[PDB]
Structures are given as C-alpha cells and as structure tokens.
Design a protein around this ligand. Structure first.
Ligand SMILES: O=C(O)CCc1nc2ccccc2c2nc(=O)c(Cc3ccccc3)nn12
Ligand SMILES: [Cl-]
Ligand SMILES: [Zn+2]
Ligand SMILES: [Zn+2]
Ligand SMILES: [Zn+2]
Length: 103
C-alpha cells in the first residue's frame, strides 16, 4: 500500500527493557526462531503470520497495536493496517538493528 508517517497507536510504544532486545529470541509460544516480531508495548516476542501467527494472537489478546519485525525492522500497526515510520520508532529499530547486524 503506502506507509504512514504517523499513526494514532504510537502512544502504545513503551520503553525498551534495560535487558535490551534479543533478535534471535524465540517465539514465546512455539519457540520458532524464524520471522519473529517484538511487541512494542510489552516486548514479548512472538512469530509472524507466515509462521504460526503468535504475534497476531498477542495483538488480539492484549490489544497491543504495534510490532517490530526481526527480519527487516519494519513496524506494522495492526489497527491502521500499515507500516509506520516515525521518530518514535527509531530507537527501538536501531537497538534491534545493532543486535541483529552485530554493530
Ligand atoms: O505478521 C504479523 O503478525 C505482523 C505483520 C502483519 N500482520 C498483519 C495482520 C493482519 C493483516 C495484515 C498484516 C500485515 N500486512 C502486511 O502487509 C505486513 C507487512 C509485510 C509483511 C511481510 C511481507 C510483506 C509485507 N505485515 N502484516
Ligand atoms: Cl530489564
Ligand atoms: Zn510462534
Ligand atoms: Zn504486547
Ligand atoms: Zn495505528
């Protein structure tokens, strides 16, 4: 489609845990190491919809809106049904990028 420069769910993006991110963390439900996302509200890690859809499940059972892909570090908002680019996402995207690419 077309990514958004903002969305009304950015307010749900929470502080990154001091433990940091582990981009190789497995899905908290199924333990897959593939195509995981991290929830930008509670930082639980769950798999994408092309694996077992545990992140989508987490959205449904928590309402948490925004998730970050450990594949390509894009942010998707489940409510807006769009990718979102915004300043509020840069820190988490960068901590993820550093952990991922060994920076
Ligand atoms: O997998 C998740 O749970 C999080 C990501 C996700 N969830 C959805 C849930 C319901 C309806 C639509 C989507 C959705 N549509 C998309 O285009 C994208 C981006 C994208 C991903 C992969 C290849 C190309 C584009 N992510 N996306
Ligand atoms: Cl912590
Ligand atoms: Zn899973
Ligand atoms: Zn969450
Ligand atoms: Zn949104």
């Amino acid at each position: 489609g077309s990514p958004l420069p903002w969305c009304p769910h950015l307010v749900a993006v929470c502080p990154i845990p001091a433990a940091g991110l582990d981009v190789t963390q497995p899905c908290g439900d199924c333990g897959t190491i593939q195509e995981n996302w991290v929830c930008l509200s509670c930082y639980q890690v769950y798999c994408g919809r092309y694996i077992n859809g545990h992140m989508l499940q987490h959205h449904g059972n928590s309402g948490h809106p925004l998730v970050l892909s450990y594949i390509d570090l894009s942010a998707w908002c489940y409510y807006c049904q769009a990718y979102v680019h915004h300043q509020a996402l840069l820190d988490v995207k960068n901590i993820a990028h550093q952990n991922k690419f060994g920076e």
